[PDB]
DNA sequence: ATTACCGGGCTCTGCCATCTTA
DNA sequence: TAAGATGGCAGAGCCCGGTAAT
């Protein structure tokens, strides 16, 4: 009877909660109280708390031996409260979606039998807490799938290979086997590939690739194509272009566009920009920023050594008073 | 003294469909 | 036989600066 006017007390977006998971306003018995209390203990603040509570109802159902207990576990990875209530704070749902303990310490012992080191550990809990909610069956089918990728490919030994893909892609193991496996017969397809160089990519610049969504990669890839084919680029130098700087693949289809035309329409050859690729982290707003300056200056562009424009704040604002 | 090369840091969460389970 | 547990989807860059090269 009290729960929907704790909720309220607590600033619960009770509409919120309720479509997400209804099943748990039906129930007899909740824990809202212990667990706003649980979460205080530990420096949560009230609107974390509501945040949390207000995206994943089932919280407020765990009891606080459970709670402690997991807590606790996941501080054998973690070195500090504040560094977990940051984490539920960005998404409650490793936390608080499974109340099986001891899949999690398998967890967390089956990592550590993989060879990672505990700052690895805590590095994949910080980045992909996901990782140890997922049974310990689908972490090992990810991994057993890492090791026979890696050895299927040119790897001296695959347990490394699996260590190193970790380490340079902390999210490798949320992500299915079926998505990962597209990635990689993508990149294998679409550019040369021999292993080397596969597992170069994969470990290394074009690690992320792996956790691109469903043919998020391949229309991707084909807009840059498209794009750059446009304007007077062959095959191979968009194959080219495109490995030296993987990120690309990461822009919207328009935003990449946009960027590609905000620096042309200031005169910027597209051979500067793609002997340049880096000039194409800087956003949108910091390009034109930066070309208003530089042109607001002597500065002509079409001659310039455009590779300022992607240069930390600092170093670009040296330079550029220099420039003057 | 200045630019090139290159890697690292952030946060990548929240929804829904399908099973298990009591 | 409804909830809870679980898997898996779609999501869509920008910036800084240490060190090597010049």
């Given at each position: 009877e009290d729960l929907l006017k704790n909720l309220l007390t607590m600033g619960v977006d009770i509409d919120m909660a309720r479509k997400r998971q209804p099943g748990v306003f039906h129930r007899m018995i909740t824990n809202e109280q212990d667990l706003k209390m649980f979460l205080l203990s530990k420096g949560?603040?009230?609107?974390?708390?509501?945040?949390?509570?207000?995206?994943?109802?089932?919280?407020?159902?765990?009891?606080?031996?459970?709670?402690?207990?997991?807590?606790?576990?996941?501080?054998?990875?973690?070195?500090?409260?504040?560094?977990?209530?940051?984490?539920?704070?960005?998404?409650?749902?490793?936390?608080?979606?499974?109340?099986?303990?001891?899949?999690?310490?398998?967890?967390?012992?089956?990592?550590?039998?993989?060879?990672?080191?505990?700052?690895?550990?805590?590095?994949?809990?910080?980045?992909?807490?996901?990782?140890?909610?997922?049974?310990?069956?689908?972490?090992?089918?990810?991994?057993?799938?890492?090791?026979?990728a890696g050895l299927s490919l040119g790897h001296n030994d695959p347990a490394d290979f699996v260590r190193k893909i970790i380490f340079k892609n902390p999210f490798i193991l949320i992500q299915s086997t079926k998505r990962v496996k597209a990635n990689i017969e993508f990149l294998r397809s679409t550019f040369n590939l021999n292993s080397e160089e596969l597992?170069?990519?994969?470990?290394?610049?074009?690690?992320?690739?792996?956790?691109?969504?469903?043919?998020?990669?391949?229309?991707?890839?084909?807009?840059?194509?498209?794009?750059?084919?446009?304007?007077?680029?062959?095959?191979?130098?968009?194959?080219?272009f495109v490995l030296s700087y993987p990120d690309v693949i990461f822009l919207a289809e328009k935003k990449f566009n946009d960027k590609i035309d905000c620096l042309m329409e200031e005169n910027i050859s597209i051979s500067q920009i793609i002997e340049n690729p880096r000039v194409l982290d800087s956003s949108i707003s910091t390009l034109k920023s930066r070309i208003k300056e530089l042109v607001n200056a002597g500065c002509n562009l079409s001659t310039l050594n455009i590779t300022l424009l992607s240069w930390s704040k600092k170093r670009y604002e040296a330079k550029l008073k220099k420039l003057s």
């Open positions: 949560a603040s009230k609107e974390v708390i509501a945040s949390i509570i207000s995206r994943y109802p089932r919280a407020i159902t765990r009891t606080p031996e459970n709670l402690s207990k997991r807590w606790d576990l996941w501080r054998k990875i973690v070195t500090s409260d504040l560094e977990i209530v940051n984490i539920l704070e960005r998404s409650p749902e490793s936390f608080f979606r499974s109340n099986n303990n001891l899949n999690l310490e398998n967890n967390i012992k089956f990592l550590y039998s993989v060879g990672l080191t505990r700052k690895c550990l805590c590095r994949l809990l910080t980045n992909a807490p996901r990782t140890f909610s997922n049974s310990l069956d689908l972490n090992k089918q990810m991994v057993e799938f890492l090791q026979a597992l170069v990519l994969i470990c290394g610049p074009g690690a992320e690739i792996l956790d691109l969504s469903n043919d998020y990669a391949r229309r991707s890839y084909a807009n840059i194509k498209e794009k750059l084919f446009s304007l007077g680029c062959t095959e191979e130098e968009v194959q080219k």
